Structure formats: C-alpha cells, structure tokens
Design an enzyme around this catalytic site. Structure first.
Site, short mmCIF file in Angstrom:
data_model
loop_
_atom_site.label_atom_id
_atom_site.label_comp_id
_atom_site.label_asym_id
_atom_site.label_seq_id
_atom_site.Cartn_x
_atom_site.Cartn_y
_atom_site.Cartn_z
N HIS A 243 54.78 33.80 15.09
CA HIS A 243 54.82 33.90 16.91
C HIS A 243 54.04 32.65 17.43
CE1 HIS A 243 57.01 37.74 17.24
NE2 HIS A 243 56.53 37.88 16.24
N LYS B 59 51.82 34.55 33.40
CA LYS B 59 51.76 34.53 32.24
C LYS B 59 50.36 34.53 31.93
CE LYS B 59 54.47 31.18 32.04
NZ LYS B 59 55.45 31.08 30.96
N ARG B 60 49.81 34.90 30.70
CA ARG B 60 48.56 34.95 30.36
C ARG B 60 47.84 33.30 30.85
NH1 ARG B 60 46.07 39.23 27.36
NH2 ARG B 60 44.47 37.76 27.65
N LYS C 167 49.66 26.92 28.47
CA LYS C 167 50.64 27.10 29.42
C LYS C 167 50.77 26.05 30.88
CE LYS C 167 50.77 31.68 27.45
NZ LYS C 167 52.27 31.96 27.42
N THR D 61 59.39 34.55 26.81
CA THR D 61 60.22 35.49 27.09
C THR D 61 60.30 35.85 28.41
OG1 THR D 61 58.72 37.18 26.78
CG2 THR D 61 60.29 36.91 24.80
N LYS E 217 63.58 36.40 31.44
CA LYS E 217 63.59 37.57 32.51
C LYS E 217 63.98 36.96 34.09
CE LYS E 217 59.47 39.63 30.02
NZ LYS E 217 58.28 39.96 30.08
O1 LIG Z 1 51.37 36.16 21.86
C1 LIG Z 1 51.71 35.55 20.83
N1 LIG Z 1 52.93 34.68 20.85
C2 LIG Z 1 53.83 34.66 21.54
O2 LIG Z 1 54.82 35.55 21.12
C3 LIG Z 1 55.88 35.59 22.09
C4 LIG Z 1 56.89 36.55 21.31
O3 LIG Z 1 57.35 35.85 20.19
C5 LIG Z 1 56.55 34.30 22.38
O4 LIG Z 1 57.50 34.20 23.16
C6 LIG Z 1 55.46 33.23 22.80
O5 LIG Z 1 56.02 32.00 23.00
C7 LIG Z 1 54.12 33.10 21.70
O6 LIG Z 1 53.13 32.44 22.42
C8 LIG Z 1 50.33 35.28 19.92
C9 LIG Z 1 49.19 35.37 20.34
C10 LIG Z 1 48.35 35.05 19.35
C11 LIG Z 1 48.76 35.16 17.88
C12 LIG Z 1 49.54 35.23 17.47
C13 LIG Z 1 50.89 35.20 18.58
#
Ligand SMILES: O=C(N[C@@H]1O[C@H](CO)[C@@H](O)[C@H](O)[C@H]1O)c1ccccc1
EC number: 2.4.1.1
Length: 816
Positions: free
Chosen positions: A357, A548-549, A554, A656, A660
């Site tokens: 991810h 978003k966070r 970002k 995501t 939305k």
């Molecule tokens: O939130 C995370 N990743 C996010 O996952 C979403 C679902 O796949 C993606 O849409 C985002 O781009 C990605 O930052 C994340 C944060 C820390 C460690 C591993 C993953």
C-alpha cells in the site's frame, strides 16, 4: 419520500414501530417521558439489528453446509464509520424506518447523528478494508474480516488557537449495539519464552499468555440476504495472572498490562515506529486469527490432511502489518502438526497473498532482530530458515551476484540488524499486488525489481475501488435518485451501468437535475458549518476541497501557495472580477509529526488573514475542516465542486478519496499519480484537470538535483509568498512562526512543491474559467460520473476473487 430508499409497507411500518417501543421499554428500561435522544437512537439500532440476525445465522450455517473456500482478510485497521444507515440501506429498510420514526414524532436523521464512528483506522488503508468487506458480502463470498477491537480509535481532533489538539476517541462509552461478544471462542496467545530442542522437534516454552476474546460484527450484503462477519479480537488477562495486601491489589491492577495490547490504535499515517506494543498487536491478531482459521478448517468436510488447506483457505495480508502470519503458519504446521518443512512451506505460499500500500521508504516495516528475539524467539528462527532457503534459490538463479543476495535478504545488516517484513511477504506469498496500475509498475521497476526478476508470475495489479452503497446511495440520495429515474436501480451493484448516462449529456432536463442536486448538497453543507461550527460561507462559490491525512507528500502546502496567490492577486487588483471560492482543507496530523502540525497552523493562519480582509469580501474563504473522519466525508464529498488530488507523482499508491469525489459530481484537479491516471483515462483527459510533473519528470529532476532557489529566483509571485511567510505577514505576533516551513521548502523539500507551482496555478485558472459556464461545467461533471464505474470495489473484489483467491463471485440471493 424517495424511491431508491425502499418501500414503506403498511405491515412493515407497524411492525417497526412496535419493536421500537418494545426495545425502548424492555431494553433501554425507559418510557417516552424520560427518554433521551440517545435512548431513541439505541431503540432504533436494536430494532434494525433484529432484522439482521436471521440472515446472519443462516449465512454462517450455509457456509458450514456448502463448505466453500473461505477468504480471510487480515488487517490492523477497519475504518467502518457509522453502521445504522448502512444497515438500513443494505436491507432496504430506510424508507420504512423513516416512516415509522416520523409517526412516532422523531426525525431519523437526528438520531443517526448520535452514533459514534467506528474509527478503527487512520485513513485510506483502513477505509479500503471497510469497502472491501461491503463488496465481499454483496458478491456472496465466504469472507471474514479479522482485526483488533481497539478501545480507542483514531483521536478526535480539536483546533485550539490554530493548533491541533488530540482527545481520546472513547467510542465504546455508551456501548456498541452492533457487536456480539463471543467469549466461547476465547483463545490463548503466547509471548516471550524460549525455544527448546527435543528429539521430536522444537518447542516454545516458558511463555506469557494473553487471552484473545472475539467480538463479531455483522456485515450485510446489498439486498442479497448475505450477512458476513467481521471478527475483532480484544486482549484479556488470564485469570491466574500474577497469582501481602499491597501485593494482592497490585497483582489485580497489573492485569491492565496484558489488556493494553488492544487498548489503542497507532495513529501513524505513512510512517514506521519500531515500538514493542505495536509488534505485540501485530502478533496478537495473527496468532488468534490463525487458530480460528485452523479450527474452522478441521471442523469442515475435509479436515488432518493439510494438502487441501490452500483449497479451503485464502489469507490476504493488508500490507505487512499481519506479515507474521507467514512464520506463524509455518510454526503451527511444523511444530504442532508435525508436517515437514517443504510441505508446510508449499501450503503457506499457496495460502498467503500480500498487498502493498505504499512505496515511501519511511513507511516500511523493518523490525530490530533483538525485539523479535526477545518477544517471538521461535518466529525469528523460522524467519532465518525461510531466508536461507530463499537466498539459496536466488543464488541458483543468479550465480555469483553477491549484491543481489544482500539486496534480497530478509535480514538487513547494519548498526542494528533488522527484518524486512516486505521481503518476508513476497517470499511467503503466491501473489503480490499493488493498488493502481502505475503503483504496481513502480513496484516491478524499482523497489521490488529483484523479486520481480526472480518470480515475475507473482506480481499483479488490483486497482482500488470504493463501495457505491456508502459512497453514493447513503451519502448522496439526491444524486442516486435522479440517476435511477433515467437508468433504474441495477447500477448500485453493477456500477459500470453508469455509462448509460453518457446518452444524457445533452439532455437539458438531466443537466438541470445534476446541477440542482449539487446546489442542494452545497446549501445543506453550508448550513451544517453554521449550525455545528458557527462559520459563514457563500454557497454560490466554487467548493474547492482537499480532505485527507496531513502529509508532506499529499502537498497541502502546494494548495496553501495557490490560496495565497489568489489572495495577493485580489489585493493587487481589488475591483477586478474573480470566480469566488470556498477553499476547504481538512485532515488529521500524526501526533509526533511536527511539519504536519505546522501545516495545519499555516492553513488556519491564512484563514485568519483572508477571512477578515474587508477588501476580499465573500470572494475568497479558507476553512480548515476539523475532525475529518468517515462521517464528515459523507457530508463534504457530495457538496464538493473541485477535488484536490495533488500528490507528487510517484508517491500516492492509489488514493480512494479521489474516486469518492468523482462519483459524487466534483471535477478533479490532480497530478498523474496513483489512480488519478486511470480516472483520467476512463473519463478522457479533456474532462480532467491534469497538471505537473509525471513520474519520469520527477526522476529526471532527482538525477539533476532539485534546487528550490531556482524557482524562487524566476517566479516573482512565488517570491512574494515566501517573503510574506518569512516576514510574519501571516503571524504578526510571532514573525518567525513559519521559519521551519520556509526552510524546508527552500532547502530540504523531498516533494518538489515549487517545481509544480506554475503549472498548478495555470491549471487552476482553467478550472475557474469553466466554472463561469455552469452548463459546460455540469456536462463535464456528467462525463465523470458516467465513467466512474471501474472504481467500484465490486470490480476490485471480483478481480481478487478470480485472479488471487481462486473463487467465483455470486450475485444470487440467499432465502429471506
Ligand atoms: O495508508 C496507507 N497507504 C494508503 O493505502 C490506500 C489504500 O490502498 C491508498 O489508496 C493510498 O494511496 C495509500 O497511501 C499506509 C500507511 C502506512 C503504511 C502502509 C500503508
């Protein structure tokens, strides 16, 4: 009132009303004269929950009888939000409950606001898990979500003096009507201890025991009578724990230490902290879940022989957080079931699959060996053995390539030895996927290149999606209705049907309806801000939103620079017309992330100046949206005109939130990053506001060396903003307040904010131009909504099912 919300039958409304009154009396122990509005919510929640249970029992009974391949989705995060409306929608009860509550003299919408978000996630990864559960149930898959029941979810954010303050999210305070405790399935989890070698295998002895108690939450499919289970583990001390009066009392109080494991969600969005408590949480979920999996497999029609294990079980690892599933499965098969290594390994690989991810290096899990050595001594041994056998395969495939060996090793040598969990996951899984086409390609080309060369068949793409139930029908009933009027209701579980809307792009009735729904959403959200937060906005302005966070990648800071550019242009030519904007930015910062906290303060500080400048008037407003969470997203997203998706190319794995906004009638300004690329491809690049460096341009800049000063020197508008920040224009009492921000932008900006500034500002001008033409704005909107079908998580999940888990989706109903 509206058709998409189901029928309000005479028998139904009468039955709901009496069951409502029954719960109020017998369950809440109240009468109408003493009932708080919270009591009314709980009476309704219980009434709706009653309608789930028969389907829940028969679904789980059905899986026992038919014995399908079971899918286990392992995640440390499930970002569920509120459950009441979602349950009503999926059961087709919303109108009936609306009618029933109306007749009791109650406003259902008011009751709905009383429910706490289940905020058991940080952002995109946790929300993806939640959308996935909804789609898996809707597609009739025998799926289980497994996680941790945190007592405290993501913190509630308060803004005080422009600064973020955190408060504990005590979401269970009033109880959770949606969960069912299952103490009968309480399971032991082991920690610490040591490894003994005997004549017949290794044994893990002298361990501490913590109990895992499951809580089951129902997951209803969309109108198919399927109700699946999300099972969340809670940590409990064993009763002989730690067992003088002071000593006795202390022994009882020390039970808290064991139960701390499930106490709180780690608030890290895209960053890694090697904390022991986090490792304990990771093993806790994995150990308890695998015992449950194996139990269910033995109690099946096959289980004894584990050859069939991968035919009856799929385990999906949501990033590396549950990566200890791989050596835990080996441990169980080898140490407890007495299978030989080679067979155990075959079973494990065929069972497990891993989804990555993120590619950000600081987010990758690399656990110190001394930690694993102390906490999980047997697992470290298994990991070493996995590594040796894996590197033997590499050595045979690429003889003499010594540096490949060090690069591919699960063990990273250095000052402290670490285990690379991502390397573990690739080695022990039969499939590895990214979450958008460009992200999956970046995995094969850069960070997992060596692994791709060794095992190309293992690597896949599964572009993310969102559930059209929560993210259209639930949060935007008005738009769902005007669509159903033209094309019917079948698109709700088959979102590709939205393409039929293309033949309405020149339909003057439809254009007026789309624009009208948006205006109503904007008016409602404009009123929300006044009622709940006492802030006054112009509902005729363009709603420009970035939610978003808060993270440097970002690039909320790039948005801030645009905002200040608009303000400076107005101050330069006050009596010139500009398209009015309401700029909304929202999101939480991780508690220890100083820069992210400084960015929030900057946004509010800009607001303080801009919102009180009499020359600006109502032409520009800058609002920081406090406590952004699922329930707030359901409100702001339908109200948005412009979706800001402006991450540096190559950094946002998918996104995501972008999807939305697309589904809800906002146009997108964004970089060619993550899923933006596929969104633009689906809608047509002319129907998207694309700007900035592509991944290749970023790479070229890195090779040359990024010099921020160059941009400062050549762009006078940019220079003005930096000088304003530096001189204390946005912080008159504390002139140097933003020195860290300026310093970072000018000397250590990993995300090249300045490099995209010119194209961004120019692209924003094109957005403003189109908004001046309501008819052509709306026609472009229609073309976005009509092509958003690919981004349904039903599509995503059907691809996982067919290409990874080896199971077929089913749209057929179970009996009611
Ligand atoms: O939130 C995370 N990743 C996010 O996952 C979403 C679902 O796949 C993606 O849409 C985002 O781009 C990605 O930052 C994340 C944060 C820390 C460690 C591993 C993953």
């Amino acid at each position: 009132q509206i058709s998409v919300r189901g029928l309000a039958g005479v028998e139904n409304v009468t039955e709901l009303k009496k069951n409502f009154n029954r719960h109020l009396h017998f369950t809440l122990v109240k009468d109408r004269n003493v009932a708080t509005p919270r009591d009314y919510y709980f009476a309704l929640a219980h009434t709706v929950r009653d309608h789930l249970v028969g389907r829940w029992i028969r679904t789980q009974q059905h899986y026992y009888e038919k014995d399908p391949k079971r899918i286990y989705y392992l995640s440390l995060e499930f970002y569920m939000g509120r459950t009441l409306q979602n349950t009503m929608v999926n059961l087709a009860l919303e109108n009936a409950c609306d009618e029933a509550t109306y007749q009791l003299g109650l406003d259902m919408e008011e009751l709905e606001e009383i429910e706490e978000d289940a905020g058991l996630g940080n952002g995109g990864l946790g929300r993806l898990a939640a959308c996935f559960l909804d789609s898996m149930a809707t597609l009739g898959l025998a799926a289980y979500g497994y996680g941790i029941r945190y007592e405290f979810g993501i913190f509630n954010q308060k803004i005080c003096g422009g600064w973020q303050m955190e408060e504990a999210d005590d979401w269970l305070r009033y109880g959770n009507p949606w969960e069912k405790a299952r103490p009968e399935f309480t399971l032991p989890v082991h920690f610490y201890g040591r490894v003994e070698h005997t004549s017949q295998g290794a044994k893990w002895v002298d361990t501490q025991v913590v109990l895992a108690m499951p809580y089951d939450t129902p997951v209803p499919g969309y109108r198919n009578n399927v109700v699946n289970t999300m099972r969340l583990w809670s940590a409990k001390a064993p009763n002989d724990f730690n067992l003088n009066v002071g000593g006795y009392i202390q022994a009882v109080l020390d039970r808290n230490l064991a139960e701390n494991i499930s106490r709180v969600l780690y608030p890290n969005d895209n960053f890694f902290e090697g904390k022991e408590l986090r490792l304990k949480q990771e093993y806790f979920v994995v150990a308890a879940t695998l015992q449950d999996i194996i139990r269910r497999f033995k109690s099946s029609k096959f289980g004894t022989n584990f050859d069939a294990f991968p035919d009856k079980v799929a385990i999906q690892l949501n990033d590396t957080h549950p990566s200890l599933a791989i050596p835990e499965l080996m441990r169980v098969l080898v140490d407890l079931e007495r299978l030989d290594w080679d067979k155990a390994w075959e079973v494990t690989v065929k069972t497990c699959a891993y989804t990555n991810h993120t590619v950000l290096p600081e987010a990758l899990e690399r656990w110190p060996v001394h930690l694993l050595e102390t906490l999980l001594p047997r697992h470290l041994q298994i990991i070493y053995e996995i590594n040796q056998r894996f590197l033997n395969r590499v050595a045979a495939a690429f003889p003499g390539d010594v540096d490949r060996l060090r690069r591919m090793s699960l063990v990273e040598e250095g000052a402290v030895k670490r285990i690379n969990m991502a390397h573990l996951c690739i080695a022990g899984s039969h499939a590895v996927n990214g979450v958008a086409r460009i992200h999956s390609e970046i995995l094969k080309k850069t960070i997992f290149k060596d692994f791709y060369e060794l095992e190309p068949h293992k690597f896949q793409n599964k572009t993310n999606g969102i559930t059209p139930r929560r993210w259209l029908v639930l949060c935007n009933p008005g738009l769902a209705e005007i669509i159903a009027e033209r094309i019917g209701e079948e698109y709700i579980s088959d979102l590709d049907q939205l393409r039929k809307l293309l033949s309405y792009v020149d339909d003057e009735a439809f254009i007026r309806d789309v624009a009208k729904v948006k205006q109503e959403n904007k008016l409602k959200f404009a009123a929300y801000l006044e009622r709940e937060y006492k802030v006054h906005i112009n509902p005729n302005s363009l709603f420009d939103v970035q939610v978003k966070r808060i993270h440097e990648y970002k690039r909320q800071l790039l948005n801030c620079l645009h905002v200040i550019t608009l303000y400076n242009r107005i101050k330069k030519e006050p009596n010139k017309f500009v398209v009015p904007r309401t700029v909304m930015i929202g999101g939480k910062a991780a508690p220890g992330y100083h820069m992210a906290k400084m960015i929030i303060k900057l946004i509010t500080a800009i607001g303080d100046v801009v919102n009180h400048d009499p020359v600006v008037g109502d032409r520009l407003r800058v609002i920081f949206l406090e406590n952004y969470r699922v329930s707030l997203a359901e409100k702001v997203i339908p109200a948005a005109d412009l979706s800001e998706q402006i991450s540096t190319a190559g950094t946002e794995a998918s996104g995501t939130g972008n999807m939305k906004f697309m589904l809800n009638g906002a146009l997108t300004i964004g970089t060619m990053d993550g899923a933006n690329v596929e969104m633009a491809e689906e809608a047509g690049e002319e129907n998207f506001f694309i700007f900035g460096m592509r991944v290749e341009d970023v790479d070229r800049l890195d090779q040359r060396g990024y010099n921020a000063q160059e941009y400062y020197d050549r762009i006078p508008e940019l220079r003005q903003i930096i000088e304003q920040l530096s001189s204390g224009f946005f912080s008159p009492k504390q002139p140097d307040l933003f020195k860290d921000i300026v310093n970072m932008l000018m000397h250590h900006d990993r995300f090249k904010v300045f490099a995209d500034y010119e194209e961004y500002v120019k692209c924003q001008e094109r957005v403003s131009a189109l908004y001046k033409n309501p008819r052509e704005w709306t026609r472009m909107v229609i073309r976005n909504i009509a092509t958003s079908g690919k981004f349904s998580s039903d599509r995503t999940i059907a691809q996982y099912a067919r290409e990874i888990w080896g199971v077929e989706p089913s749209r057929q109903r179970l009996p009611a």
